[PDB]
Paper text:
One such antibody, the 10E8 antibody from donor N152, is perhaps the broadest of all HIV-1 antibodies thus far identified. The 10E8 antibody recognizes an epitope in the membrane-proximal external region (MPER) of the HIV-1 gp41 transmembrane glycoprotein. Like other MPER-directed antibodies, the 10E8 antibody is able to recognize its gp41 epitope in the membrane context, a trait that it appears to acquire during maturation, as this trait is not present in V gene-reverted germline versions of these antibodies. Here we combined an additional round of NGS from the same January 2011 time point with structure-function studies of germline and mature 10E8 antibodies and of their maturation intermediates to approximate the developmental pathway for the 10E8 lineage.
Numbering used by the authors:
A (entry chain L): 2 to 9, 11 to 95, 95A, 95B, 95C, 96 to 106, 106A, 107 to 210
B (entry chain H): 1 to 52, 52A, 52B, 52C, 53 to 82, 82A, 82B, 82C, ...
Write the structure that this text describes.
């Protein structure tokens, strides 16, 4: 990922928010910016430097400094809630294009809520099928953005991990799921496994052990 | 008034081939650069490649993961852009977007985007789910329990609890497509810990494609 963005930011109605993109190619080129709402295709918001297409209001503006590019929204409105992506060349002189990882912008419409986390060890029945899945379920959080990290014996592990993007609950908060697939032998060979969930800069941990 | 409409997405096996089309109007097609961009379910945008206008040489450039496997071409007489996808891989599963591409060295930007068409790559055929309990045991007054629905194909699976009588606190998550080309999902419910000895909790898993229904009673360890 030659272009890097923060995964998530939030803003209150009427306030100003800045989303930043970083990469070596931004020293040579402007970044363009794209807005994508759930279930819709992207739309261009800024191109060149601070060119807003027709239909894009003035409150969106672009700027750049060194190897960074920034999208600023002044006076955030509910309709500005979306994922935002930057794009530019991957390096100077290249004929290729790349995107940043995207930033989820939440326009705050309900209280910030910390996730409830439950980590399920592999069921005995699944082990009988010669498989082992740790299931980390994450619910009731807002804004709908988390990062999930797994540990085995207190050290990081991220092979065999699959994580769903947060989606809405019936009560309008967010939930997400993460899976760590192991062999039965891997599962019974370690002392502990942990699911670490970071939300709004705070991290909670749940741990399970192949004993007890 | 600019219109871009992608078509041709479908289910295809690894190693197979698939041809996407993007039909365009509302701009002078022959003078436009045109790109493809893709997005795996729940993930970010990834540039696929771009073809220049005839006046600018008509040449193509490709992202490293697809170079040598996909071909971008255009038929200006039909206002149509194509993506010929060969040697398909499971990691190519994504919505594929067509984008009119502006230019001004200088970078390129994506002026207009289509709706997208979905490409799913898997070697699997119809396969019913295996259902495993996510059992509660020793969050305060409440406990979470659920059902893990593993390795089915194709989508969808639906899940209810107690034949629909239980809805409060229920959440069924989106499915994950694994490298195996099979899907898995989970469903969870949060209930009062004191009900675990009073109320029975059964997840009802329906997989219409395989003519399968599974009921799993979930009990504490």
């Amino acid at each position: 990922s030659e272009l890097t963005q923060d995964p998530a930011v939030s803003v209150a109605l009427g306030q100003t928010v800045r989303i930043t993109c970083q990469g070596d190619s931004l020293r040579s080129y402007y970044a363009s910016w794209y807005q994508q709402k759930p279930g819709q295709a992207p739309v261009l918001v800024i191109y060149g430097k601070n060119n807003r297409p027709s239909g894009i209001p003035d409150r969106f503006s672009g700027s750049s400094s060194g190897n960074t590019a920034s999208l600023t929204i002044t006076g955030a409105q509910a309709e500005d809630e979306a994922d935002y992506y930057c794009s530019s060349r991957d390096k100077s002189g290249s004929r290729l294009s790349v995107f940043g990882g995207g930033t989820k912008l939440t326009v705050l419409s309900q209280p910030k809520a910390a996730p409830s986390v439950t980590l399920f060890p592999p069921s005995s029945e699944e082990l009988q099928a010669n498989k082992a899945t740790l299931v980390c379920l994450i619910s009731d959080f807002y804004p709908g953005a988390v990062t999930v990290a797994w540990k085995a014996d207190s050290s990081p592990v991220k092979a065999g991990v699959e994580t769903t993007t947060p989606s809405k609950q019936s009560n309008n908060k967010y939930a997400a799921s993460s899976y760590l697939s192991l062999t039965p032998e891997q599962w019974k060979s370690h002392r502990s496994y942990s699911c670490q969930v970071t939300h709004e800069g705070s991290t909670v941990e749940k741990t399970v052990a192949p004993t007890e | 008034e600019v219109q871009l409409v992608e078509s041709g997405g479908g289910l295809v096996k690894p190693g197979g081939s698939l041809r996407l089309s993007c039909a365009a109007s509302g701009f002078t097609f022959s003078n436009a650069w045109m790109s493809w961009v893709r997005q795996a379910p729940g993930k970010g945008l990834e540039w696929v490649g771009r073809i220049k206008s005839k006046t600018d040489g008509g040449t193509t450039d490709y992202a490293a993961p697809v170079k040598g496997r996909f071909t971008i071409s255009r038929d200006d007489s039909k206002n149509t852009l194509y993506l010929q996808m060969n040697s398909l891989k499971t990691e190519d599963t994504a919505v594929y977007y067509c984008a009119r591409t502006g230019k001004y060295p200088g970078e390129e930007y994506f002026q207009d985007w289509g709706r997208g068409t979905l490409v799913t790559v898997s070697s699997a055929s119809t396969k019913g789910p295996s259902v495993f309990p996510l059992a509660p045991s020793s969050s305060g007054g409440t406990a979470a329990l659920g059902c893990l629905v593993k390795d089915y194909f194709p989508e969808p699976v639906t899940v209810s609890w107690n034949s629909g009588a239980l809805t409060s606190g229920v959440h069924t998550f989106p499915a994950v497509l694994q490298s195996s080309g099979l899907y898995s999902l989970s469903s969870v419910v949060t209930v009062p810990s004191s009900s675990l000895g009073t109320q029975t909790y059964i997840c009802n898993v329906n997989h219409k494609p395989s003519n399968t229904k599974v009921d799993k009673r979930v009990e504490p360890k």
